[PDB]
Design an enzyme around this catalytic site. Structure first.
Site, PDB file in Angstrom:
ATOM      1  N   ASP A  40       0.832  -1.145  -0.053  1.00 50.35           N
ATOM      2  CA  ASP A  40       0.038   0.142   0.121  1.00 50.35           C
ATOM      3  C   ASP A  40       0.946   1.386   0.074  1.00 50.35           C
ATOM      4  OD1 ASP A  40      -2.139   1.757   0.191  1.00 50.35           O
ATOM      5  OD2 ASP A  40      -2.738   1.153   2.310  1.00 50.35           O
ATOM      6  N   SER A  41       1.719   1.588   0.941  1.00 49.24           N
ATOM      7  CA  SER A  41       2.780   2.503   1.091  1.00 49.24           C
ATOM      8  C   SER A  41       3.955   1.768   0.165  1.00 49.24           C
ATOM      9  CB  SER A  41       3.050   2.883   2.479  1.00 49.24           C
ATOM     10  OG  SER A  41       3.600   1.701   3.142  1.00 49.24           O
ATOM     11  N   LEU A  42       4.614   2.785  -0.245  1.00 55.17           N
ATOM     12  CA  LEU A  42       6.089   2.383  -0.768  1.00 55.17           C
ATOM     13  C   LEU A  42       5.826   1.856  -2.241  1.00 55.17           C
ATOM     14  N   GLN A  48       3.036   3.530  -4.253  1.00 54.64           N
ATOM     15  CA  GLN A  48       2.411   4.699  -4.492  1.00 54.64           C
ATOM     16  C   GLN A  48       3.265   5.934  -4.041  1.00 54.64           C
ATOM     17  OE1 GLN A  48      -1.649   4.429  -3.167  1.00 54.64           O
ATOM     18  NE2 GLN A  48      -2.209   6.033  -4.532  1.00 54.64           N
TER      19      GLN A  48
END
Ligand SMILES: CCCCCCCCCCCCCCCCCC(=O)OC[C@H](COP(=O)([O-])OCC(O)COP(=O)([O-])OC[C@@H](COC(=O)CCCCCCCCCCCCCCCCC)OC(=O)CCCCCCCCCCCCCCCCC)OC(=O)CCCCCCCCCCCCCCCCC
Ligand SMILES: CCCCCCCCCCCCCCCCCC(=O)OC[C@H](COP(=O)(O)OCCN)OC(=O)CCCCCCCCCCCCCCCCC
Lengths: 165, 458, 57, 90, 74, 56, 167, 141, 83, 114
Positions: I38-40, I42
């Site tokens: 999810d992070s890293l 986008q």
């Protein structure tokens, strides 16, 4: 003193216009990224800004801090003015060590340009007059006052050593 | 005035006698021809004094003061044509005649030769100015401000008739200021205090104080069409010069009670400048500025001893041109934005670059740029009251510092971005907007070339 | 837009015009020609000194 | 986000199309219109400097004879005695 | 225009890139290094020097004092 | 001796000449940064002259 | 703003605050994956306080010691010369009043200037036909259908569709 | 010519829920933390119902603020809280209240006592007694 | 003084696909949609343009940046690209 | 100093139905842009937030006012307060100077100006 920073802001102004938008000490690089001349112009100015060993303002800076020998001050004053001579000197290498020394890093599309004889006319006219500033004017002047002419042991030129450290 | 009132009264049977829209170009044309006749017979020499003809004129010998009185009528007709042209022609011509009638009493005034003709001419105004506030003004709450425009000046001026006739029946006759050679002194009593009190207090009604001045930001706030009689109201406030006529003699030695007029006009001086940095109105913005350095001159007079009459002669005309010019700036930028509130004027300096020079030099007369007619007199107020004591430079100097912010507080409001609005306000500063904006600094710095005529006796 | 005197780059070290470097080289020498008058002839204190000025007798 | 997909496709066909419209210079569209119209160094400096020399020097020669205080030049500052005087000094 | 082609730099020297070897005791490890190693290597290790480089390499610091001194000298 | 300070007044006069030529009174084909630089260029040797008379 | 995307607003600035303090490029680059291992503590879990206590201790040591005069990317909300180009400042539609012999220049530009206006002069038979329809009563952000169901012109025509270009 | 709720009125408890928002929408449905209860303390000449003060304040500071113009430049519709003090004022930085500058100015407050001392160059201190002997005592011979 | 056109960004967005060592140079060029790569993912996928372009990447730039050509689309609107 | 300013707080799940306070302003924003975009306006927006601002600030404060509290009579400590104090300075002034001007002399003899 009037010779100094009108050169220096203008000499550093060509650097900022070369990148056209950061004007930060961050993201600069080394001195030699096809930049021969303006790096030579800075070290004339930055070494003078260390505290004048024999550069431009030597006949004014040295004849005052060694005129602080005979005085009647607070004696906190000589314990405050002479310390800033080092603090003046560390201003010099700060743009050497962060904009002129390290690895090249700044964003891409390297659009540098140093070829305009309009600017070359300005820099060449100053540094000829800049180096001979304190050495022609004070060379021929009618005297007004009496010099110090006594600067004893452990009391004479150690403010230059303050610049060295 | 041998024949100065005589040509200008003949201008009155020319408005309704004339044709259609020719009435503007005809009225301005005749009007400037009198301006040379003003300059010619006056400005003569000059050593105590020029008693002019007779019992109706003393020629304004010590202070000329009369050239400024005659610029304005060929100066406001070009200004009042902004928003007036919506009515019947017979109704518009009446609005022309009443302003011309305002000048004729003031032409005989400022010279006046006497004192019993002074007061009837000192009260000969306030009849045409009041009618201008009633008809063809702005939105409501006019009528109370018309009542506050009365009931102060008339409230204070009535003891002058109590004072002057008490002098006329006692010692000689006040027809002649020059038969005032024998003047008995006035000692401290409980009757003579009131004799000085009624002699002075009526003149504080017009040039204001920290007290009794609430009416002044009503006529300038609720004002006629586009600064029309507001320019005349500048001369109406500065035209309280008659303290120079009266208290030069006729109890001069009562200075023991001078102090509460010195002090009240001094802490009120520094206060009313800062009472407008949070004001939200343009026509109120110049109004509170026009209190402060107009309250500067009062301590130059009650303190006697010249090097104080020198600057006070010049400080009457100082804002008299300047605040008249600032109202010309404020009369403009209202035909284009139909609200006078200053905050809505974000995003200027780009649509009107030509008048942007005129904003600069106008507000450069409050900082005032010491080779001008403004800081040449304020240095003499320094030169007087510092000999009074060493404290007086403090509160008077901060007045030179607060209006430094307070003038540039207006200039920076012109510089903003993207303006959010304004499919109207298109008009790029037409000929009437900038030719009328001229002829203010054009004599002002002209008078700074050889400022010899702007000097009292003194 | 109009001229291509100095090329755009993508960090490939775009070269110089090789004529500014001559004037860059020249004024790095005449400033150190001025190391002559630093010592020759100029000393730190051309004054003489005091022998801790004792001999009052 | 699938909502703005039809957005910014017609906007590029409008905004950049307006910028395609804004990029517009038909044959350098200055008319101007009507009308028209180094070595010398002969009058560009002669009008500049060589003319106001004589005017202001006339304003000083016609000034000393009128005003009782002309140039107020100071003393001699002379250590010997010289030929401008008759005596000498050691 | 087409100067940044891929498989061009392909980090080979670059002692600055030894920190990507330093994380081998943890393991991150591959992605990526070419961002910070964009313009460090190549002729970008020219590496202007210490106090000698502010003397400009001792190239002109002491050139003309021995050639000027000296003649006549009697 | 009269030209000791007379050249100073000439130096204190030619600064107004780019201002007098701002009133569009047969002004130069514009080149105004160039024209100002030329206007400064001749004042310097004019400024250089009375410095020699002072030090004597 | 939601709890899951509250992590994202901190995650970009967590590394953006660090390159302010670095001196090299690899020194900053070595601490990218080095700070990633702290982010790899709780990889995927529930959305409760266990995910909030990872953020509740991200209050300290994120604001605590935060960006001593950082990089600003000068064309930004802050930073020097952010709105410097204001002598031009793009006065779009300052060109109504001309009184010609000043409208002599750009002949084809004015001929196209009145052309685009008919797109704005005729849109309210289409844009206002859906403006009463697309808004339910008084609800959310009021962009139209981004094709306007036949031809989107613009919907934001023309002050936004011909908005101010920078230079 | 807008007469209906043209300004504020003698509030703040004349059915304050019917104030916001029958007109002057400072609150949505009188529970938005901006219902016209915040008549500071009344009795004075402050603001009445007054679509005015103690609403969230201390800066319009020209933020990023893209969903409208909405920060300070570009006219959001009706959100007036306070004005004429904010075109030149800001929010909180990273440090906090600590008045160390008076302690920083106290660095000379120690040396303000040093201003009473003297500053003769030669000889050295030897601060033990009157053996320093500053001025002239005896004659020539 | 140097201008810019459409072809510069069509190099760089395609180049950083191969610069990031997690993404091989065998994906789609302009529309990979990033969910198939999810992070890293986008933020880290645009943390490199934080280094190179770096105009602070506002909050709405995350939810648009799935379509990798829709990344490229609004930059020409921001950077005011030719015609 | 001014302020902390408390730029962070807690959520999840305090006041789930508190959202869509932007629905108040986006309806006005839709009423704004529909008024803003039109082929012929040629004038300013009415903008009644500034109408209700100055007129409820410049006027309608004295109808609001009552002297029912002493913190409204508190202006006696600011208006007339220092106004006595400057005269309390100045009445001590100008007479001590006068006594040294009456009895004894201190001035220079070349004080023609003044
Ligand atoms: C095609 C070619 C055509 C050829 C044209 C003819 C050739 C040129 C004419 C020759 C020069 C005359 C023009 C006057 C300027 C020079 C004056 C001078 O120095 O001689 C002293 C001479 C004085 O006479 P004097 O015999 O030496 O002694 C008598 C007095 O006792 C002396 O003492 P004083 O009482 O006069 O006091 C001194 C002072 C005091 O005078 C004043 O300042 C008083 C005026 C302001 C009073 C306040 C009024 C407020 C309302 O006077 C001055 O101001 C001198 C400053 C320069 C003149 C001011 C210009 C104003 C415009 O002349 C004057 O000063 C008279 C002043 C009249 C001003 C006329 C201005 C005309 C301007 C025409 C337009 C030109 C525009 C050019 C633009 C070009 C493109 C940028
Ligand atoms: C309140 C009114 C105060 C008047 C008190 C009575 C004054 C008086 O009796 O006259 C004083 C004096 C004449 O009377 P006398 O003392 O006998 O002198 C010898 C001549 N017979 O000498 C005079 O005639 C002095 C004349 C001036 C005093 C009258 C005006 C004083 C009132 C002005 C104050 C300001 C106005 C206040 C009212 C307006 C506002 C509401």
């Amino acid at each position: 003193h009037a010779f100094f920073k009108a050169m220096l802001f203008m000499c550093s102004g060509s650097i900022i216009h070369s990148l056209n938008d950061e004007q930060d000490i961050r993201k600069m690089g080394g001195l030699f990224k096809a930049m021969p001349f303006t790096t030579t112009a800075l070290i004339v100015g930055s070494l003078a800004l260390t505290g004048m060993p024999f550069l431009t303002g030597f006949y004014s800076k040295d004849l005052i801090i060694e005129a602080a020998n005979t005085s009647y001050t607070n004696a906190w004053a000589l314990l405050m003015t002479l310390i800033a001579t080092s603090f003046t000197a560390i201003y010099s290498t700060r743009i050497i060590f962060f904009a002129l020394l390290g690895q090249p890093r700044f964003p891409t599309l390297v659009n540098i340009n140093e070829n305009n004889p309009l600017l070359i006319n300005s820099i060449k006219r100053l540094l000829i007059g800049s180096l001979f500033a304190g050495y022609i004017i004070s060379n021929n002047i009618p005297p007004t006052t009496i010099p110090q002419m006594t600067m004893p042991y452990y009391l004479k030129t150690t403010a230059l050593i303050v610049t060295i450290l | 005035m041998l024949k100065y009132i005589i040509p200008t009264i003949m201008l009155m049977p020319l408005t309704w006698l004339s044709k259609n829209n020719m009435i503007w170009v005809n009225s301005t044309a005749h009007s400037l021809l009198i301006s040379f006749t003003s300059l010619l017979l006056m400005n003569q020499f000059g050593d105590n004094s020029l008693n002019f003809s007779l019992l109706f004129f003393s020629d304004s010998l010590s202070t000329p003061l009369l050239i400024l009185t005659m610029w304005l009528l060929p100066l406001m007709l070009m200004a009042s044509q902004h928003h007036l042209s919506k009515e019947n022609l017979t109704r518009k011509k009446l609005f022309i005649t009443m302003l011309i009638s305002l000048q004729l009493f003031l032409i005989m005034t400022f010279t006046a030769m006497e004192l019993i003709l002074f007061y009837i001419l000192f009260e000969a105004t306030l009849v045409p100015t009041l009618i201008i506030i009633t008809r063809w003004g702005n939105q409501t709450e006019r009528l109370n401000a018309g009542l506050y425009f009365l009931f102060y000046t008339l409230a204070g001026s009535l003891p002058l008739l109590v004072a002057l006739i008490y002098i006329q029946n006692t010692v000689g006759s006040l027809n002649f200021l020059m038969l005032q050679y024998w003047v008995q002194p006035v000692h401290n009593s409980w009757s003579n205090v009131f004799m000085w009190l009624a002699c002075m207090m009526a003149f504080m009604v017009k040039m204001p104080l920290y007290g009794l001045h609430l009416w002044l930001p009503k006529a300038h706030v609720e004002a006629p069409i586009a600064g029309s009689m507001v320019l005349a109201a500048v001369l109406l406030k500065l035209g309280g010069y008659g303290m120079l006529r009266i208290t030069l003699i006729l109890n001069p030695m009562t200075d023991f009670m001078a102090y509460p007029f010195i002090m009240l006009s001094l802490w009120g001086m520094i206060m009313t400048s800062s009472i407008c940095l949070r004001q939200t109105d343009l026509k109120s913005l110049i109004a509170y500025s026009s209190v402060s350095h107009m309250a500067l001159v009062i301590v130059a007079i009650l303190i006697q001893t010249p090097w104080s009459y020198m600057g006070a002669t010049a400080l009457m005309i100082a804002h008299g041109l300047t605040s008249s010019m600032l109202f010309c700036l404020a009369n403009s930028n209202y035909e284009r934005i139909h609200s006078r509130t200053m905050i809505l004027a974000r995003g200027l300096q780009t649509l009107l670059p030509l008048m942007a020079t005129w904003w600069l030099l106008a507000s450069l007369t409050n900082l005032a740029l010491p080779p001008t007619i403004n800081l040449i007199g304020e240095l003499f107020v320094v030169m007087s009251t510092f000999s009074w004591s060493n404290i007086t430079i403090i509160l008077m100097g901060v007045n030179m510092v607060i209006t430094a912010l307070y003038s540039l507080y207006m200039l920076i409001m012109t510089q903003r971005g993207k303006y959010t609005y304004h499919i109207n306000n298109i008009s790029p500063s037409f000929t009437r907007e900038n030719a009328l904006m001229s002829l203010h600094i054009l004599p002002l710095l002209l008078l700074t070339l050889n400022p010899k005529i702007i000097l009292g006796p003194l | 837009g109009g001229g291509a005197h100095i090329e755009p780059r993508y960090r490939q070290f775009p070269q110089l015009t090789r004529s500014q470097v001559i004037q860059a080289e020249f004024f790095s020498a005449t400033m150190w020609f001025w190391i002559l008058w630093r010592f020759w002839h100029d000393s730190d204190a051309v004054l003489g000194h005091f022998p801790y000025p004792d001999p009052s007798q | 986000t699938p909502e703005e997909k039809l957005r910014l496709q017609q906007l590029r066909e409008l905004r950049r199309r307006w910028l395609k419209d804004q990029e517009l210079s038909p044959r350098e569209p200055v008319l101007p219109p009507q009308r028209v119209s180094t070595y010398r160094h002969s009058i560009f400096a002669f009008t500049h400097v060589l003319i106001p020399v004589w005017i202001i020097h006339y304003y000083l020669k016609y000034h000393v004879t009128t005003k009782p205080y002309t140039i107020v030049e100071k003393k001699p500052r002379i250590f010997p005695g010289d030929t401008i005087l008759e005596t000498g000094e050691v | 225009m087409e100067l940044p082609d891929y498989k061009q730099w392909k980090i080979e020297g670059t002692p600055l890139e030894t920190v990507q070897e330093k994380l081998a005791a943890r393991g991150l490890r591959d992605p990526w290094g070419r961002n910070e190693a964009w313009r460090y290597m190549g002729g970008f290790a020219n590496n202007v020097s210490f106090v000698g480089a502010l003397l400009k390499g001792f190239k002109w610091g002491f050139a003309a004092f021995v050639v000027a001194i000296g003649a006549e000298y009697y | 001796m009269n030209m000791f300070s007379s050249l100073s007044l000439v130096t204190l006069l030619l600064l107004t000449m780019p201002i007098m030529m701002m009133s569009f009174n047969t002004y130069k084909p514009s080149n105004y940064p160039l024209y100002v630089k030329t206007a400064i260029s001749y004042a310097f040797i004019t400024s250089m002259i009375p410095t020699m008379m002072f030090i004597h | 703003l939601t709890h899951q995307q509250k992590v994202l607003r901190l995650y970009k600035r967590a590394l953006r605050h660090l390159e302010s303090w670095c001196i090299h490029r690899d020194k900053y680059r070595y601490f990218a994956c080095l700070l990633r291992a702290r982010f790899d503590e709780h990889k995927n879990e529930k959305d409760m306080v266990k995910a909030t206590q990872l953020l509740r201790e991200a209050e300290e040591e994120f604001w605590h010691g935060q960006h001593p005069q950082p990089y600003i990317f000068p064309e930004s909300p802050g930073g020097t010369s952010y709105e410097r180009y204001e002598c031009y400042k793009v006065p779009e539609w300052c060109l109504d009043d001309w009184h010609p012999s000043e409208k002599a220049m750009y002949p084809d530009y004015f001929a196209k200037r009145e052309q685009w206006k008919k797109l704005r002069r005729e849109s309210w038979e289409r844009e206002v036909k859906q403006l009463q329809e697309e808004t339910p009563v008084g609800g959310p952000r009021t962009e139209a259908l981004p094709p306007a169901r036949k031809q989107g012109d613009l919907p934001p025509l023309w002050w936004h569709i011909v908005t101010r270009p920078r230079e | 010519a807008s007469h209906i709720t043209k300004d504020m009125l003698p509030g703040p408890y004349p059915k304050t829920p019917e104030e916001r928002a029958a007109a002057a929408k400072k609150y949505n449905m009188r529970v938005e933390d901006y219902e016209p209860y915040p008549d500071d303390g009344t009795g004075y000449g402050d603001y009445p119902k007054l679509p005015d003060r103690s609403q969230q304040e201390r800066d319009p500071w020209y933020d990023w603020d893209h969903p409208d113009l909405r920060l300070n430049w570009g006219e959001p519709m009706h959100w007036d809280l306070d004005m004429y003090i904010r075109n030149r004022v800001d929010t909180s930085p990273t440090p906090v209240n600590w008045n160390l500058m008076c302690k920083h100015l106290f660095g000379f407050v120690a040396f303000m006592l040093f201003m009473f001392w003297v500053g003769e160059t030669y000889p050295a201190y030897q601060p033990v007694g009157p053996k320093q002997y500053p001025y002239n005592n005896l004659y020539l011979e | 003084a140097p201008p810019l056109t459409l072809e510069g960004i069509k190099d760089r967005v395609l180049y950083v696909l191969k610069l990031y060592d997690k993404i091989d140079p065998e994906k789609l060029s302009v529309n990979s949609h990033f969910m198939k790569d999810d992070s890293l993912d986008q933020v880290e996928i645009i943390m490199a343009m934080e280094d190179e372009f770096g105009f602070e990447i506002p909050d709405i730039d995350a939810e648009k940046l799935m379509c990798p050509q829709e990344i490229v689309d609004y930059i020409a609107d921001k950077k005011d690209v030719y015609e | 100093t001014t302020l902390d300013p408390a730029e962070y707080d807690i959520s999840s799940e305090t006041r789930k139905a508190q959202a869509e306070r932007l629905a108040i302003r986006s309806r006005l924003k839709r009423e704004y842009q529909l008024q803003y975009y039109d082929p012929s306006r040629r004038g300013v927006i009415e903008d009644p937030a500034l109408v209700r601002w100055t007129y409820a600030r410049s006027a309608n404060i004295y109808p609001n006012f009552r002297p029912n509290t002493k913190t409204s009579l508190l202006g006696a400590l600011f208006g007339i307060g220092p106004l006595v104090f400057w005269y309390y300075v100045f009445k001590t002034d100008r007479d001590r100077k006068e006594k040294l001007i009456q009895e004894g002399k201190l001035d220079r003899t070349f004080n023609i100006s003044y």
